[PDB]
Symmetry: D2
C-alpha cells in the first residue's frame, strides 16, 4: 500500500500517551516516518525502548520514551515539562492511552472505579493543560482524543470503560470552544475493533470473529495503521479547519 506524506508534519513536536504498544505504537511510528520529533509515555518499558530503537534503525528521528504511570498526575505533568525542555514546545497531542479491562457493575468498588477513571479519563485533561501554553507560543496546535465504538454499540461487560470513552466527546467539545481562539484544534478519533496483539490475546474468540463479520461493512482486519493515518491527517495542515468533531474509523460497524 502507498501511504500519504504530510510535509507539514516534518519537524513538528508530537506528544503521545500510551505510545509503546498497540495503536499508540503505530501512531508513534507513523509520525516518526513523517520526520516529526515524537515523545511518548508508557509503563511498558521493554516494548517502548524496542520501538524507539526500531524506528531509528529504519532511518527516522528516534522518539523520546519516558516511563510514566498516567495515574500519577504530578509525575506525568513533570514528565511533559521535562520533554518540552528537550524537544521544545509541542505542536500535537495524542491522548491515546486507555485500558479496556472488563468488569461487572455489581463487583466494582469505589477504589476500582476511581482507578478506571484515573487510567482512562483523567490523564487526557492534564495532558492538555501541560501542552497548551507551548501550543500558543507555536501559533496553534492539534489535539486528538481517543474514544471507542464501545459506547456507540451499547457494549456490555465494562460500564466504567464505556462511561470514560463517552466522556472524551465532552472533553473534546468543551476544549474546542475554549482553545479555538488560539488556533488549537481538538477532535475525537473513534476506533472500531482494532486487531492489536492485546485484543487478539484477551478478548477475541470465535463468537467475536462472527460479530466482526456480521457488523463490519468491509471484511478483514481493522489495524493500528488505519487509525494512525486518521491521526496524521488531523495533526497535519490538511485538516486546519477541523475541530470539535468525531472521526470514526471502524470499517462500518456503528
Amino acid at each position: 500500500v502507498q501511504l500519504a506524506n504530510f510535509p507539514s508534519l516534518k519537524g513538528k513536536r508530537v506528544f503521545i500517551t500510551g505510545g509503546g504498544t498497540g495503536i499508540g505504537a503505530a501512531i508513534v511510528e507513523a509520525f516518526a516516518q513523517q520526520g516529526a520529533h515524537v515523545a511518548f509515555v508508557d509503563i511498558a518499558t521493554e516494548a517502548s525502548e524496542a520501538l524507539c530503537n526500531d524506528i531509528a534503525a529504519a532511518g527516522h528521528p528516534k522518539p523520546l520514551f519516558r516511563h510514566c504511570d498516567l495515574r500519577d498526575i504530578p509525575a506525568f505533568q513533570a514528565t511533559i515539562a521535562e520533554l518540552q525542555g528537550q524537544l521544545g514546545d509541542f505542536d500535537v497531542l495524542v491522548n491515546n492511552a486507555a485500558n479496556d479491562q472488563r468488569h461487572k457493575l455489581e463487583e466494582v468498588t469505589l477504589e476500582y472505579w476511581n482507578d478506571r477513571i484515573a487510567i482512562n479519563q483523567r490523564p487526557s485533561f492534564f495532558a492538555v493543560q501541560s501542552v497548551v501554553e507551548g501550543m500558543k507560543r507555536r501559533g496553534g496546535g492539534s489535539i486528538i482524543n481517543f474514544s471507542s465504538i464501545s459506547w456507540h454499540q451499547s457494549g456490555g461487560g465494562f460500564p466504567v470503560y464505556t462511561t470514560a470513552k463517552a466522556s472524551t466527546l465532552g472533553l473534546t467539545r468543551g476544549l474546542a470552544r475554549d482553545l479555538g481562539p488560539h488556533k488549537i484544534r481538538v477532535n475525537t478519533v473513534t476506533p472500531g475493533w482494532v486487531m492489536t496483539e492485546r485484543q487478539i490475546k484477551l478478548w477475541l474468540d470465535e463468537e467475536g470473529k462472527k460479530a466482526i463479520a456480521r457488523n463490519q461493512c468491509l471484511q478483514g482486519d481493522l489495524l493500528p495503521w488505519h487509525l494512525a493515518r486518521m491521526v496524521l491527517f488531523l495533526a497535519a495542515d490538511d485538516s486546519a479547519m477541523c475541530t470539535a468533531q468525531e472521526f470514526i474509523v471502524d470499517a462500518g460497524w456503528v
Copy 2:
C-alpha cells in the same frame, strides 16, 4: 395546562439524586403527584424539608428526604439501603444531581478535577449499583440519567463539566446492555437551558437571553416541569421498550 396522569406510577418507589431544588425538585413533585413513593438525597436541608412539607400539604405522599453528600460513596450507598428498608425495593432511579460551576483549563488542580467528577459523574454509577438487586426482585425498573446540551453545543467555560455530562451517554449505553436482560431500562435525558433559580441567579445575563432567543426554535422559558414530564414518561409503563437512548428536551437548541 392539563398534564398527563400515569396510572402505572401509583405506588412505585422512586429514588432521585439532588431532589431538593431545581429540576430535581420538579421531578420529586411530579412523581409524588402521580402517587409514587419518592425518596431523595440532597445537601440543601432547608429547601428539601420545605419541599417535602409542601407536597404533603398538597395531598400527595410525603417524599422521604435524607441529607447526604454524594461525594461520600459509602454514606450514599448506606443511605439508599436505609431508604430501601423504609419504602421497599426501588422501581425507578433518577440520576439528576450535578453542579455546573465554571472553571478554566489552566486553573484546574488535580483536587478540583477529582471533586468535579465526584459530584457530576461518580454518584450515578454507585446509585445504579445500589438499586439494581431490588429492581430485579421487582421484575424490572427504569433508570434515567441526566446529560446536558452543554457538550452538544461545544460549550466553553467548564471543560470538566462537559466531560462529565458526555460521560452519561456511556454510562447509559453500557448499562442498557448489561441490565436489559432484567427488564431494566436505562435512558439519558438531556435538558436545554432550563430557567431554574440557580441559572437565573448565577449564569443568565443580557447576552445569555440573546443566545436563548437566537438558538431556541420555540421562544420562552424551558422550565423544570418540562423536564419532569419526560422523566415521568420514561419511568411509566408507556415507555417499556425505550432503552439506551437520549431524550433531548431543549426547545430546539441542539
Copy 3:
C-alpha cells in the same frame, strides 16, 4: 399495562397518514382513546373502515377515514382540506405512512426511484403545507415525522428507503426552525423493528428472530402500541418544549 391519560388531547384534531394498518392504526386508536378527533388517509380501504368501526365499538370518537394515494399530491391536499372542513383546523399531524419494499441498487429504474420517493418522502412535506395555516390559527401544534432505525443500522437491501428515512431528520429540523415562531413543534420518531403483521409476514425468518435477540437490549416484541405512546407524548401539552429532536423507540438496537 395501565397506560397514561393525556387530558390535553381531548377534543384535539389529529391527522395521520397511513393510519389504516400497522403502527398508523395503533396511533389512530391511541388518539381516539384519549378523546381526540382523528382523521386519517390510507389505500387499505377494508382494513381502515374496520378499524374505524372497532374504535367506535370501543366507545371512542369515530375516526374519519378517507381513501387517498399519497403519491397524488393534489388529491392528498384536497382530502386534507375536506377533512379540515369536517373537523376544523388540525392541532396534530403524524407523518407515518411509508413502504419498506426491498430493492437492489443495480435494479432500480428512474421510475422506481421516483415512486419510492413519492411514497416515502414527498407526502410529509405537503401534509405539513396543508395543516400549517390551521395550526397557526389554533395558536400552535405538533408535527411528528417517522424515521427508521434502518439508516442508523446501515441496513442493507433498500438504499432508496434508507435515503428517504434519513431525509425525515432534515425535514423535521428545517421545519422546527421555520415553524417554531408559530408555537408549532416538529419532532422525529424512530422505531426499531416493530412486530406489525406486515413485518412478521413479509420480512421475518428464524435469522431475523436471532438478529432481534442479539441486537435489542430488552428482550421481547417491540409493538405498535409502544410507538403510539411516544407519539401521544409528543402531541400532548406535556412535551410543549420538545422540538427538532429524534425520539428513538427501539428496545436498545441502535
Copy 4:
C-alpha cells in the same frame, strides 16, 4: 501551507458531480494535483472549461469536462458511460453537486419540490449505479457523498434542501452495507459554511459574518480547499477501512 501527497491517487480514475465551481472545482483541482485522471459534469460551461485549462497550465493531468444537467438521469448516465469509455472504470466517485436556493414551506409547489429533489438528491443514487460495476472490476473503490451542516443546525429558510441534505446519510449508510462486500467504501462529507464565491455573493451579509464568528470555534474562513483535503483522504489508500461514517469539516460550528 505544505499539503499532503497521496501516492495511491496517482493514475486513479475520479468522477465528480458539479466540479466546475465552488467546492467541486477545488476537489477537481486537488485530485488532478495528485496525478489522478479526473472527469466531471456541470452546467457552468465557461467556468468548467476555464478550470480544465488552468489545471492543464499548472502541469497536471487535464480533467475531462462534460456539460450535463443532472436533472436528466438518462443523459447523466449516458455521460458517465461515455467518460468510462475515455478513462476506463472509475475508482472514486464524489457526489458534490447541489443547489441551496432558499424557499418557504407555504410557497413550494409540487413542481418546485420535485425539481429540488431532482437537483439535490436523485443524481447521487444514479451516479453510484453508473460507477459500481467498474469499481467491482477495479477490485473496490471509494464514494464520497456531500451533506451539509444546514440540517444539523436546524437551518431555516430551505426545508426541501435540509431534507435532501439529511437524506445523504441514509444513501451513504444503506450503500456502505450493500457495497462493502465489493471493497467499496461509502462515506459522507459535511461542510460548514464554506466561503465559495456563490455563498459570499448570494447569502452573506454583516449578520452572517457575526453568526460565523459566534458559531465557529476556529476563526477565519472555511474554504473549498479544506473540504478538498478531506475528500482526498477518503479516496486514498490511507482511509481503506473508513466506511458508513460522516466526516464534518466545519471549523467547530455543529
